[model samples]
Target: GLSDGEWQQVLNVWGKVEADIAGHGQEVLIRLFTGHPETLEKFDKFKHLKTEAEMKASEDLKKHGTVVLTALGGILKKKGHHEAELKPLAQSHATKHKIPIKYLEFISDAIIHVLHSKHPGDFGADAQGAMTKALELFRNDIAAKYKELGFQ
Candidate 1:
């Protein structure tokens, strides 16, 4: 639904956010916007590079892209809604990934620390809440794979 330039902005923001998360050794689990024709073309090209099973999963994802995007939009709209419930679950996931609790905490503390250190006003807020929502969405998405596989 975004215009060309707007779509590019979306891609740019998502790319930066994706890279930041990857820097912390986490997978970039969702695509935010894809109105660009080239986006689908690139996905088509890269889809073949995946293993057959992976390709199948990618195809399934492609088929449900709209639903996924809608869900992401809903989460963004409800920012700060579920911090108490989501944060602990995300920390558990971090523990599973062997990321130190202090490091996980730093994702929140670092942002505010940097912001406040640089500017006089409030650091506004931190991203760990949003990060948790993103992680929860990804966790549920991947968990669906286990359900598909009939895992215990």
Candidate 2:
């Protein structure tokens, strides 16, 4: 959990990045990382933190940072590449991590729907929207799953 000051800082930083990405597009990824090196590094290390103590120590920071990065990555990947390929990747990762495929499917479908709704013409827009939605959904699903497992 974050101290009050840390929570405030997280919100301030998160809001700035959210606004930038929402207005200028996913190219803001570089700027986000530049603004918060420690948070970004913690997010990147999420999969490597093996112990409960390490994960607990950084969980809040990691979760917040990940939500931002995943959102950015999703939008960037969608704008730059084929998002359809990501479903398989998500499924594979979910299996390896013991994450539920149902959750992965939920995210995949949400992304596809968002893409189809937002940009049905240009591949860039379509992919970007889908990827962005998928990332957001995945992050939320993670938290929801944790709640189900009775983790505080």
Candidate 3:
């Protein structure tokens, strides 16, 4: 959990990132798919993007990235108070979304990567760590609730 100040730090950094969802979203996916090509299997739109240029040009990827970025924005708004909210989303991912779970943790890593690239010196590691702790709760919940689904 973050102190009230830490909570604001999470919001402040994310506020900047999400405000430019188009650019940062693409950058995050650029970082994610570039680093872990296998992770693109979960993405219908980006799977075809063989190059970063294609990723940058693809509308489907842009829109897809925007949706998740804003959705993540909503989830992360209450940084320290997210466990209860993340629980159901995790269950939904298992029973409904029904995809492989590796991407669960990858997303947190991707977003954090972009945040660092976007402003490494501004937010500081504590803000980054705060978000890691907060967002990891999502994958942690998924791991616990869907243990039989595997990838824990």
lDDT by residue for model 2 (1-152), tens: 22344334433333444543332222232233333333234345444544444544554544554554455454333332434544444443444444444443443444344334444553354334434444454445454545555433
Best by TM-score: 3
lDDT of residue 2 for candidate 1: 25
lDDT of 2 at 7: 34
lDDT: worst 10-residue window of model 3: 78-87
Stretches of model 2 off by over 4 angstroms after superposition: 1-33, 40-123, 149-152
**What C-alpha lDDT does candidate 2 achieve relative to the native structure?**
0.42
All candidates' TM-scores? 0.25, 0.26, 0.81
Query: Which residue pairs come into collision in candidate 3?
Result: none
- Selected candidate, larger lDDT, 1 vs 2: 2
Runs with alpha carbons beyond 4 Å of true place in candidate 1: 1-23, 26-126
Candidate ranking under lDDT, highest first, comes to: 3, 2, 1
Pick by TM-score: 2 or 3, better one:
3
Ten residues in a row with the worst lDDT in model 2?
Answer: 22-31
